[PDB]
């Protein structure tokens, strides 16, 4: 390195074996990504299949008992077990795998291994981008989903009473988590969630509009009508007329992109920015800081029974979600609330 | 071209007199790796203590601990 | 062969087929 002898050690041979053109790239981070991702997907697929939730949540989350792919999940542990990492050698399991699965330690297994697999994979984007020598903007882009994973699956349950309030790995489980943040956190109303929604919707917007614009500016480039074969990877000319595209969106939308570096940087920018802002919002919700009340709105609705908004309807509807769902959603709370204290409308 | 000659600058000059002066081979990479491994084991120890998952005779991990 | 492609494809294939068999078996259990 840098015009030196560099007498070969085991590091050089290991690095030369790790950086080779194979069916799947391994690299140094393959020491983490491949096993950690393997146990992540294996734990999720096994817990959706065999590992039950009749212990922890008192409900069915396995393929063996009648839950579909949309229904089965790797359920979180219980609130009484706290934020314990639930090792096999931990005081809860005490080295019994059969009852480790039943207490939900597989969830902590999958969560920690998925986190470390994320670390290893985006480290691998560094390793590949260094192996073939370009900027790691793939890594800067994927920095946002791992922040989402940290904020949602780690920071929020750490701020709450335990991993029970963490999202269980599944489909209906994530659906319950979403409805939980609606009922208890008013997560739609939080501006950081609003900026996350704006970022992701603008990113889907940009992806669709950019793909369509390139596809409809593809030049002639041949005589066959199949334009995909009209492209040549050898040719150095642009596959699309960006002049035509710019004047098109300048006359349709008013303003159009004039530099494709700015276009592609902006379509990198919008989803990463949106996910990062929504991650900060979930960081806020981790400490039960929620954008719940608009004090002027509740004061004026209190002094005037005639004023109301869709916001007021949404707040009262959140109270309904909380009251009717937490009763079985939180078994550790022993919520034997009778039906006449549960709130209703007329006729429903 | 020459910089402003300074008394405290020529006092602290030796401390900046060996920029890039670097030992060959792997050096003490094995020693720092061992130190990092011990530091990680110590960090895991304090994590599992602060998780109420490494129960010891004298550590209670509660407000009663300072009772 | 037993190369990295062999190991990766088999580590993906063996438990997927095993669990596909298990689920096809679970399709016929009555309460």
């Amino acid at each position: 390195i840098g015009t030196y002898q560099e007498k070969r050690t085991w590091f050089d041979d290991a690095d030369d074996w790790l950086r080779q053109d194979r069916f799947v790239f391994v690299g140094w981070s393959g020491l983490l990504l491949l096993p950690c991702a393997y146990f992540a997907v294996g734990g999720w697929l096994t817990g959706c299949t065999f590992v039950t939730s009749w212990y922890t949540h008192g409900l069915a989350s396995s393929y063996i008992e009648g839950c579909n792919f949309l229904t089965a999940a790797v359920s979180t542990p219980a609130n009484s077990l706290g934020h314990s990492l639930l090792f096999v050698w931990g005081p809860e399991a005490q080295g019994d795998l059969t009852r480790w699965f039943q207490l939900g330690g597989l969830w902590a297994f999958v969560a920690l291994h998925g986190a470390f697999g994320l670390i290893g994979f985006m480290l691998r984007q560094f390793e590949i981008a260094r192996s073939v020598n370009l900027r790691p903007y793939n890594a800067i882009a994927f920095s946002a989903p791992i922040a989402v994973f940290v904020s949602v699956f780690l920071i929020y349950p750490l701020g709450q009473s335990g991993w029970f309030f963490a999202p269980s790995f599944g489909v209906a489980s994530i659906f319950r988590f979403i409805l939980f943040f609606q009922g208890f956190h008013n997560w739609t109303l939080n501006p950081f969630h609003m900026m996350g929604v704006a970022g992701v919707l603008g990113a889907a917007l940009l992806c669709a509009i950019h793909g369509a614009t390139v596809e409809n500016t593809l030049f002639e480039d041949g005589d066959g009508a199949n334009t995909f074969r009209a492209f040549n990877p050898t040719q150095a000319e642009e596959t699309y007329s960006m002049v035509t595209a710019n004047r098109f969106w300048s006359q349709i939308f008013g303003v159009a992109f004039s530099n494709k570096r700015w276009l592609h940087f902006f379509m990198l920018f919008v989803p990463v920015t949106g996910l990062w802002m929504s991650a900060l919002g979930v960081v806020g919700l981790a400490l039960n800081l929620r954008a719940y009340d608009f004090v002027s709105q509740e004061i004026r609705a209190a002094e005037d029974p005639e004023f109301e908004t869709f916001y007021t309807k949404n707040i009262l509807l959140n109270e309904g979600i909380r009251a009717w769902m937490a009763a079985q959603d939180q078994p550790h709370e022993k919520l034997t609330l009778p039906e006449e204290v549960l709130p209703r409308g007329n006729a429903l | 071209e020459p910089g402003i000659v300074t008394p405290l600058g020529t006092l602290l000059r030796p401390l900046n007199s060996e920029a890039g002066k670097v030992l060959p081979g792997w050096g003490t990479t094995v020693l720092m790796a061992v130190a990092i491994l011990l530091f990680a084991v110590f960090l895991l120890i304090i994590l599992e203590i602060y998780n109420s998952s490494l129960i010891l005779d004298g550590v209670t991990n509660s407000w009663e601990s300072l009772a | 062969i037993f190369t990295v492609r062999w190991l990766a494809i088999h580590a993906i294939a063996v438990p997927t087929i095993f669990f596909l068999g298990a689920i096809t078996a679970m399709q016929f259990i009555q309460r």
Binding site: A14, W17, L18, V26, L31, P35, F87, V88, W89, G90, P91, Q94, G95 | V41, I45, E48, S53, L54, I55, L56, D57 | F2, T3, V4, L7
Partner: peptide, 30 residues
């Protein structure tokens, strides 16, 4: 004294040591 949690933690770090040893042997092979 030597609490069962601490003894299990020692066996756990030994197990992690042999797991990384096996992974190092596997990546040295093939």
């Amino acid at each position: 004294s030597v609490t069962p949690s601490l003894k299990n933690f020692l066996l756990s770090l030994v197990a992690g040591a042999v797991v990384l040893a096996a992974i190092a042997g596997a990546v040295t092979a093939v």
